[PDB]
Ligand binder design. Structure first.
Ligand SMILES: Nc1ncnc2c1ncn2[C@@H]1O[C@H](COP(=O)(O)O)[C@@H](O)[C@H]1O
Ligand SMILES: [Zn+2]
Length: 177
DNA sequence: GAATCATAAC
């Protein structure tokens, strides 16, 4: 509600933090990345929330998507890593920001069940699905009951086995390399 | 003992 909530804004203004910059968006590395590659794609024109998304933003949304992919190719093309581009249903930090994150989930910043389910349940809306939603309906359909998904038991995104803890989940992920 | 959770953060 003060200063920390503005961090994203601050870091997007910071030239050192800008991995990519153009007339519409700026892309920065996630300060507490939940994987080996984790970038945030932010529009210069602030947008409050996914509930306030219209057709006007469609050309911007596609652009953010495209830009994410560029960064993924430009800085992680050599990696044989699978990526995902999408948004959190409920952001914590102010503004809407696109997540581009590698599916290894090998990062010490991933510490609790909230993180894992925020990237591995319907709480994480894919960018393509969002874009199609604004194209088809002119608005994003966000199913109710998102905060309950954050409490769901740990399930691996590759093998699909249920796991009991963040430490055992990390060790289980290690073997998928 | 270790992991998770709830909550405050001056
Ligand atoms: N100063 C910062 N610079 C860059 N990324 C940040 C900063 N502070 C927080 N973040 C990231 O912003 C994300 C929040 O996005 P969201 O979950 O969409 O609300 C988290 O993954 C944080 O790690
Ligand atoms: Zn697995």
């Amino acid at each position: 509600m003060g200063h920390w909530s503005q961090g994203l804004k601050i870091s997007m203004q910071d030239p050192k933090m800008q991995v990519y910059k153009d007339e519409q968006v700026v892309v920065i590395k996630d300060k507490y990345p939940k994987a080996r590659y984790h970038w945030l794609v932010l529009p210069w024109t602030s947008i409050s929330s996914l509930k306030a998304v219209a057709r006007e933003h469609l050309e911007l949304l596609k652009h953010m998507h495209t830009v994410g992919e560029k960064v993924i190719v430009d800085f992680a093309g050599s990696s044989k890593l699978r990526f995902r581009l999408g948004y959190h249903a409920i952001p914590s930090m102010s503004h809407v920001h696109l997540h581009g994150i590698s599916q290894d989930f090998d990062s010490p910043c991933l510490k609790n069940k909230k993180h894992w389910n925020s990237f591995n349940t319907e709480y994480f809306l894919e960018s393509q699905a969002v874009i199609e939603m604004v194209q088809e309906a002119g608005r994003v359909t966000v199913r109710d009951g998102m905060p309950e998904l954050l409490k769901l038991p740990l399930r691996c995104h590759e093998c699909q086995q249920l796991l009991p803890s963040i430490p055992q989940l990390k060790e289980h992920l290690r073997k998928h390399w």
